[PDB]
């Protein structure tokens, strides 16, 4: 088998010291099984250094465990040297446009199955055969959990910022005009603080009261319109529809989302804008968003929602545009066509899928 690292579906944990697998207990404290994997432990797919086995478990792995306890076939698992979900690609001598990553690693003919959350779609189903889906999803959008910077910060940022300079200049001019001493300056300051000559003083007091009332009203109006949080309605928000520089948004390369946008007509300039900063891994984009690098990460439902509910800084708002279902892949008409489908449907009816979902997808943020 070949699998791609995706949480909360499969976990990648390095082997401890000698070579044993660390034991873990779940929320119930019951044992959680795991197996041994081999892959590029070194780093990102650059220099191919040592490939020491690691411990793997999650949501897909125990599904394969149950699928294997029936039809009793012995199995070994190893990750993919590429690290991308097998899309179409050309070469410098493009006359075949073969398959990279997961699908190619199975299509080239050295692996048996695909156990990973790969979205089923038309052209994949044409070139490869799937089974009955066991999870449905639709890709949403996320963003940082706003910004709580509104705490006595707009001291001089209420649109026009000339308030303090204008007030000081007017007070100084009035004090100079009325000067016909330190006591006079203190009285003028008190006029600004409510701590002939009489008529001028009364007029100045009225002017100061009017200015104070106007300033209070302006501050209230400025601090009544701080409500924002556009939150992105969906893919039909004009703000993201126009490609701008301060609201960059992208998606992992060589994956389902890229092929879905690149094939469906809708428009071209959105794909052009997104292709500039398409990432190279599945999870590093989440860290980039959490830092501040990206503000809209287009990715499919389950993983996005679980990550959003994992760390209390990322939330999703939208309408769940487009829909599909995760499958379980395999070669073109392998002798294992029917039993996998029968077992997956029996489990789907039985409720085992519910047990797995409740075990490995739960909430901690709230």
């Amino acid at each position: 088998i070949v699998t791609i690292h995706q949480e909360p579906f499969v976990y990648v944990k390095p082997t401890m010291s000698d070579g044993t697998c660390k034991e873990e207990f779940t929320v119930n404290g019951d044992p959680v099984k795991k197996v041994i994997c081999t892959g590029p432990n070194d780093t990102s797919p650059g220099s191919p250094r040592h490939t020491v086995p690691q411990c793997c478990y999650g949501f897909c792995i125990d599904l394969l465990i149950k699928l294997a306890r029936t039809m009793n076939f012995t199995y070994e698992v190893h990750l993919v040297a590429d690290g991308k979900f097998g899309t179409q690609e050309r070469v410098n001598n493009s006359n075949k446009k073969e398959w990279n990553g997961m699908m190619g690693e199975l299509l080239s003919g050295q692996a048996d199955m695909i156990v990973a959350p790969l979205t089923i779609n038309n052209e994949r189903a044409q070139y490869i055969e799937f089974s009955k889906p066991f999870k449905y999803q639709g890709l949403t959008i996320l963003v940082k959990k706003e910004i709580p910077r509104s705490t006595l910060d707009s001291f001089m940022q209420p649109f026009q910022s000339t308030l303090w300079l204008l007030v000081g200049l007017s007070v100084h001019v009035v004090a100079v005009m009325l000067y016909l001493l330190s006591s006079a300056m203190w009285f003028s300051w008190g006029v600004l603080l409510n701590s002939s000559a009489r008529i001028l003083g009364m007029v100045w007091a009225g002017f100061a009261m009017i200015i104070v009332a106007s300033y209070t009203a302006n501050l209230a109006a400025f601090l009544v319109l701080d409500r924002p949080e556009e939150r992105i309605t969906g893919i039909n928000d004009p703000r993201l529809r126009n490609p701008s520089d301060k609201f960059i948004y992208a998606t992992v390369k060589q994956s389902s989302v890229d092929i879905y946008f690149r094939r469906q007509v809708e428009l071209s300039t959105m794909y052009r804008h997104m292709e500039k900063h398409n990432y190279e891994s599945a999870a590093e984009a989440i860290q980039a968003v959490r830092d501040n690098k990206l503000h809209a990460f287009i990715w499919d439902s389950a993983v996005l929602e679980f990550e959003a509910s994992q760390k209390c800084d990322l939330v999703t708002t939208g309408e769940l545009f487009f829909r599909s279902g995760f499958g379980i892949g395999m070669r073109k008409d392998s002798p294992w066509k029917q039993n996998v489908s029968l077992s997956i449907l029996k489990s789907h009816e039985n409720g085992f899928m519910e047990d797995l979902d409740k075990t490995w997808v739960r909430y901690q943020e709230c």
């Binding site: 308030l163 007017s170 005009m177 008529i199 001028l200 007029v203 002017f207 106007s214 302006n218």
Partner: peptide, 30 residues
């Protein structure tokens, strides 16, 4: 102090300063 409001406030302040100067001169006269 939004455009019209600020302009009206400044004009009123200038007019009041002028009127106060005139009234002070008149009071000093008598």
């Amino acid at each position: 102090m939004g455009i019209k409001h600020f302009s009206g406030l400044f004009v009123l302040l200038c007019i009041g300063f002028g009127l106060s100067i005139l009234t002070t001169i008149g009071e000093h006269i008598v």
